[model samples]
Target: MHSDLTFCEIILMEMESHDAAWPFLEPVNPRLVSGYRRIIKNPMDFSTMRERLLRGGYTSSEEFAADALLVFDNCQTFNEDDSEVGKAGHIMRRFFESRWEEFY
Candidate 1:
């Protein structure tokens, strides 16, 4: 599952031009966000997951839900393989570094 590469690149360009972070992770979609929170409410025995963030203190359900939704939606748009998506994410970082130059 790959996002439109050109579209992603363009967004990177625009975000850098304005010295802002990526917008997709900015104002999350309300409906999707609500859905994420709703899912987290269900009891999960996190002992087996081995990578659970739920066994924590002072975690805001809404903020956790927002971040999880970001991860989920982002993963849906790209392969989960570290090499593949890591490369893309790296490119995004470099793009900002080249374009913004002391901005963000």
Candidate 2:
């Protein structure tokens, strides 16, 4: 179904527009955040996911979800649970999960 790709794009757009999504809209800058590269070996973000989707880099919905969930995974690893960024991650994660289930 061609809509499969569109489905992914829809989810991406919804997340990108979320208020808590500001912190995750782009790649984490290693120069600004100390030890980010070392702690987070594989970083993921909305911009990268969108680019990959546009380039046909994902072959399946599972692959897309993996990258989608990874943004929060990395966030939790790098930030404290009570911190502002961490709270945003939790919010986005919950939002993504509910939307994912609704779509599926």
Candidate 3:
């Protein structure tokens, strides 16, 4: 693995350990969330990102960040701004962005 991939893995672990990461820890289940399939065409989550990363799917830090941000984007699209999950998404996004800048 390359140095950039190592950094991505470290950040991914940090994000997973975060308290606000609960809503994004895994893929969204359409059975539990109504309209999830109809609304969010592409769903991204920490688990899937980690799997892809481990399999050498991401080519660069930018690609890894894109998937990370996609989780929050999907949250915004599917949840109300004031809702618990939406608020958590905001927190997680800020946390990721700040950490990403520090490394990159």
Per-prediction tally of clashes: 0, 0, 0
Q: Summarize candidate 2's per-residue lDDT along 8-81 as a digit string, tens digits.
A: 98999999999999899889999999999999989999999999999999888889999999899999999999
Instruction: Write candidate 1's Cα lDDT for 1-104 as tens digits.
Output: 12233333343345434432333224334365445444433322112111333234313333333333344345334433365544544444555446434432
Error of 2 at 5 (Å): 1.6
Model 1, residue 3: displacement in angstroms? 31
Q: What is residue 26's positional error in candidate 2, in angstroms?
A: 1.0
What C-alpha lDDT, on a 0 to 100 scale, does residue 57 get in candidate 3?
A: 94
lDDT of 2 at 48: 99
Q: Determine which window of 10 residues in candidate 3 has minimal summed lDDT.
A: 1-10
lDDT score at residue 73, model 2, on the 0-100 scale: 94
The better-scoring model by lDDT among 1 and 3 is 3
Model 3 lDDT tens row, 73-100: 9999999999999999999999999999
Tell me the TM-score of each prediction against the true structure: 0.24, 0.95, 0.96
lDDT of each: 0.37, 0.93, 0.93
**Residue 63 CA error for candidate 3 (Å)?**
0.8
